[PDB]
Design an enzyme around this catalytic site. Structure first.
Site, PDB file in Angstrom:
ATOM      1  N   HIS A   1      46.493  41.646  33.408  1.00 25.29           N
ATOM      2  CA  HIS A   1      46.848  40.410  34.157  1.00 25.29           C
ATOM      3  C   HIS A   1      45.945  39.278  33.707  1.00 25.29           C
ATOM      4  O   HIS A   1      46.277  38.078  33.946  1.00 25.29           O
ATOM      5  CB  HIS A   1      46.788  40.661  35.644  1.00 25.29           C
ATOM      6  CG  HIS A   1      45.448  40.499  36.275  1.00 25.29           C
ATOM      7  ND1 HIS A   1      44.670  41.553  36.691  1.00 25.29           N
ATOM      8  CD2 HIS A   1      44.733  39.379  36.569  1.00 25.29           C
ATOM      9  CE1 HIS A   1      43.600  41.096  37.299  1.00 25.29           C
ATOM     10  NE2 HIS A   1      43.585  39.787  37.194  1.00 25.29           N
TER      11      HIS A   1
ATOM     12  N   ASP B   1      48.020  47.706  34.996  1.00 26.59           N
ATOM     13  CA  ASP B   1      47.149  46.576  34.741  1.00 26.59           C
ATOM     14  C   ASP B   1      45.991  46.981  33.787  1.00 26.59           C
ATOM     15  O   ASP B   1      44.850  47.127  34.147  1.00 26.59           O
ATOM     16  CB  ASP B   1      46.575  45.988  36.022  1.00 26.59           C
ATOM     17  CG  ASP B   1      45.944  44.645  35.811  1.00 26.59           C
ATOM     18  OD1 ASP B   1      46.156  44.035  34.748  1.00 26.59           O
ATOM     19  OD2 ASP B   1      45.167  44.229  36.724  1.00 26.59           O
TER      20      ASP B   1
ATOM     21  N   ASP C   1      32.514  44.452  48.032  1.00 25.97           N
ATOM     22  CA  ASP C   1      33.746  44.556  47.315  1.00 25.97           C
ATOM     23  C   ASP C   1      33.606  44.000  45.896  1.00 25.97           C
ATOM     24  O   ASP C   1      32.637  43.288  45.583  1.00 25.97           O
ATOM     25  CB  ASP C   1      34.807  43.765  48.044  1.00 25.97           C
ATOM     26  CG  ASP C   1      36.176  44.288  47.890  1.00 25.97           C
ATOM     27  OD1 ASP C   1      36.530  45.121  46.996  1.00 25.97           O
ATOM     28  OD2 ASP C   1      37.048  43.853  48.719  1.00 25.97           O
TER      29      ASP C   1
ATOM     30  N   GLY D   1      37.506  37.213  39.418  1.00 26.07           N
ATOM     31  CA  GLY D   1      36.553  37.017  38.392  1.00 26.07           C
ATOM     32  C   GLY D   1      35.930  38.308  37.851  1.00 26.07           C
ATOM     33  O   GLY D   1      35.354  38.251  36.757  1.00 26.07           O
TER      34      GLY D   1
ATOM     35  N   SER E   1      37.888  40.937  37.538  1.00 23.66           N
ATOM     36  CA  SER E   1      39.019  41.550  36.910  1.00 23.66           C
ATOM     37  C   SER E   1      38.723  41.947  35.473  1.00 23.66           C
ATOM     38  O   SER E   1      38.182  41.166  34.691  1.00 23.66           O
ATOM     39  CB  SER E   1      40.206  40.614  36.858  1.00 23.66           C
ATOM     40  OG  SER E   1      40.667  40.368  38.202  1.00 23.66           O
ATOM     41  N   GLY E   2      39.173  43.167  35.157  1.00 20.32           N
ATOM     42  CA  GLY E   2      39.014  43.668  33.791  1.00 20.32           C
ATOM     43  C   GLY E   2      37.741  44.467  33.577  1.00 20.32           C
ATOM     44  O   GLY E   2      37.652  45.244  32.601  1.00 20.32           O
TER      45      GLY E   2
HETATM   46  C1  7LR Z   1      49.559  37.497  42.026  1.00 20.52           C
HETATM   47  S1  7LR Z   1      50.038  38.046  40.336  1.00 20.52           S
HETATM   48  O1  7LR Z   1      51.019  37.127  39.786  1.00 20.52           O
HETATM   49  O2  7LR Z   1      50.392  39.406  40.527  1.00 20.52           O
HETATM   50  N1  7LR Z   1      48.761  37.840  39.304  1.00 20.52           N
HETATM   51  C2  7LR Z   1      48.531  36.471  38.749  1.00 20.52           C
HETATM   52  C3  7LR Z   1      47.891  36.582  37.393  1.00 20.52           C
HETATM   53  N2  7LR Z   1      48.421  37.341  36.426  1.00 20.52           N
HETATM   54  O3  7LR Z   1      46.837  36.015  37.181  1.00 20.52           O
HETATM   55  C4  7LR Z   1      47.699  38.744  39.530  1.00 20.52           C
HETATM   56  C5  7LR Z   1      47.837  40.118  39.226  1.00 20.52           C
HETATM   57  C6  7LR Z   1      46.703  40.894  39.475  1.00 20.52           C
HETATM   58 CL1  7LR Z   1      46.814  42.574  39.033  1.00 20.52          CL
HETATM   59  C7  7LR Z   1      45.543  40.355  40.038  1.00 20.52           C
HETATM   60  C8  7LR Z   1      45.470  39.000  40.398  1.00 20.52           C
HETATM   61  C9  7LR Z   1      44.231  38.371  40.984  1.00 20.52           C
HETATM   62  C10 7LR Z   1      43.428  39.337  41.838  1.00 20.52           C
HETATM   63  O4  7LR Z   1      44.017  39.992  42.720  1.00 20.52           O
HETATM   64  N3  7LR Z   1      42.116  39.406  41.507  1.00 20.52           N
HETATM   65  C11 7LR Z   1      41.243  40.246  42.172  1.00 20.52           C
HETATM   66  C12 7LR Z   1      40.325  41.013  41.441  1.00 20.52           C
HETATM   67  C13 7LR Z   1      39.472  41.855  42.036  1.00 20.52           C
HETATM   68  C14 7LR Z   1      39.531  42.029  43.419  1.00 20.52           C
HETATM   69  N4  7LR Z   1      38.821  42.810  44.306  1.00 20.52           N
HETATM   70  C15 7LR Z   1      39.281  42.525  45.559  1.00 20.52           C
HETATM   71  N5  7LR Z   1      38.782  43.214  46.654  1.00 20.52           N
HETATM   72  N6  7LR Z   1      40.210  41.627  45.519  1.00 20.52           N
HETATM   73  C16 7LR Z   1      40.431  41.250  44.169  1.00 20.52           C
HETATM   74  C17 7LR Z   1      41.262  40.352  43.581  1.00 20.52           C
HETATM   75  C18 7LR Z   1      46.579  38.198  40.112  1.00 20.52           C
END
Ligand code: 7LR
Ligand code: CA
Ligand code: CL
Lengths: 58, 250
Positions: B41, B90, B182, B186, B188-189
């Site tokens: 993502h 993902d 948690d 940011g 992510s990945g």
């Molecule tokens: C809404 S979408 O269109 O499906 N899409 C948009 C895009 N592609 O940017 C997308 C997909 C995914 Cl899989 C993830 C996110 C952002 C996200 O949820 N971040 C995140 C990260 C770590 C966390 N730890 C906790 N507790 N919460 C977290 C949140 C967005």
């Protein structure tokens, strides 16, 4: 021994073989000791080890 | 990361920072000298695929200390099953243009075998998650790399305890439901790393959640064990022209 229980006693990876046979294996950068279970590094920076911590305890 | 601590410099030596035109994009995990695992993502909105940089050995984003190593990302490989704008599948495999040099501050995390990961690592309760993401929900990102120990839930328990995407077989939950601690946006990945008998392994990718540190909700991670054979086959393949590659899954 069987890989499902206690990882076959292997430190790292376990393979079941026909009979009461099991073989442990190690990731690249490690070798299997003569115990048949333990893996020891063979390179300076094996995967999944933290050099500053491994030096703190050596 | 919410409610964690600074990862002492060199103690998270597999963590990758991904930059796009110098700006923080996402985290990743080094699994050998040319290969990084991240979240699919992260790449939905990339305009110029040729300005993606991976940084190894990073710690404090405010300073250059000489341990950092930057590489261009040559290939971003995403499973055919991932759909942009959704959460499932993902995962991304990134090939660097040149290997990083392994050092005390740059070390790969082990990509486990599937059986090992499913039968053994999946039952280790606590694992580490790390990143330069937001320190709070709706808050500023971190300048020093942060780390948090989180416990893993069986999915039936996550669903029972939680109170909207499903949690699929390509995901798992981990963390706390009391709003205290948690992963966050940011992060992510980045890695969810699991210790077993003296060695650390890649078991998850920071993927998503409902807000961050939201009461009654847990962080969601890509279940890397589903992708071991997919990743391993790709790492044995020759590179193909063009940065983005969609590769069949399974
Ligand atoms: C809404 S979408 O269109 O499906 N899409 C948009 C895009 N592609 O940017 C997308 C997909 C995914 Cl899989 C993830 C996110 C952002 C996200 O949820 N971040 C995140 C990260 C770590 C966390 N730890 C906790 N507790 N919460 C977290 C949140 C967005
Ligand atoms: Ca720095
Ligand atoms: Cl291209």
């Amino acid at each position: 021994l069987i890989c499902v229980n206690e990882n076959g006693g292997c430190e790292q990876y376990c393979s079941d073989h026909t009979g009461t046979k099991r073989s442990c294996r190690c990731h690249e950068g490690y070798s299997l000791l003569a115990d048949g279970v333990s893996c020891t590094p063979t390179v300076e920076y094996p995967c999944g080890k933290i050099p500053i911590l491994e030096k703190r305890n050596a | 990361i919410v409610g964690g601590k600074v990862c002492p410099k060199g103690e998270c030596p597999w963590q990758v920072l991904l930059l796009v035109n110098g700006a923080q994009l996402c985290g990743g995990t080094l699994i050998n000298t040319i290969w990084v695992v991240s979240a699919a993502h992260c790449f939905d909105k990339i305009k110029n695929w040729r300005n993606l940089i991976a940084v190894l050995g990073e710690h404090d984003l405010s300073e250059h200390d000489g341990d950092e190593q930057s590489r261009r990302v040559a290939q971003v490989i995403i499973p055919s099953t991932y759909v942009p704008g959704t959460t499932n599948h993902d995962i991304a495999l990134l090939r660097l243009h040149q290997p990083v040099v392994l050092t005390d501050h740059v070390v790969p995390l082990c990509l486990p075998e599937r059986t090992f990961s499913e039968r053994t690592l999946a039952f280790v309760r606590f694992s580490l998650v790390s990143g330069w993401g937001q320190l709070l929900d709706r808050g500023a990102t971190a300048l020093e790399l942060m780390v948090l120990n989180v416990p893993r839930l069986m999915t039936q328990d996550c669903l029972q305890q939680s109170r909207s995407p499903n949690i699929t077989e390509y995901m798992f939950c981990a963390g706390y439901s009391d709003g205290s601690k948690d992963s966050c946006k940011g992060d992510s990945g980045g890695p969810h790393a699991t210790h077993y008998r003296g060695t650390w392994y890649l078991t998850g990718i920071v993927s998503w959640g409902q807000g961050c540190a939201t009461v009654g909700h847990f962080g969601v991670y890509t279940r890397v064990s589903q992708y071991i054979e997919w990743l391993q086959k790709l790492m044995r393949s020759e590179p193909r022209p063009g940065v983005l590659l969609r590769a069949p899954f399974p």
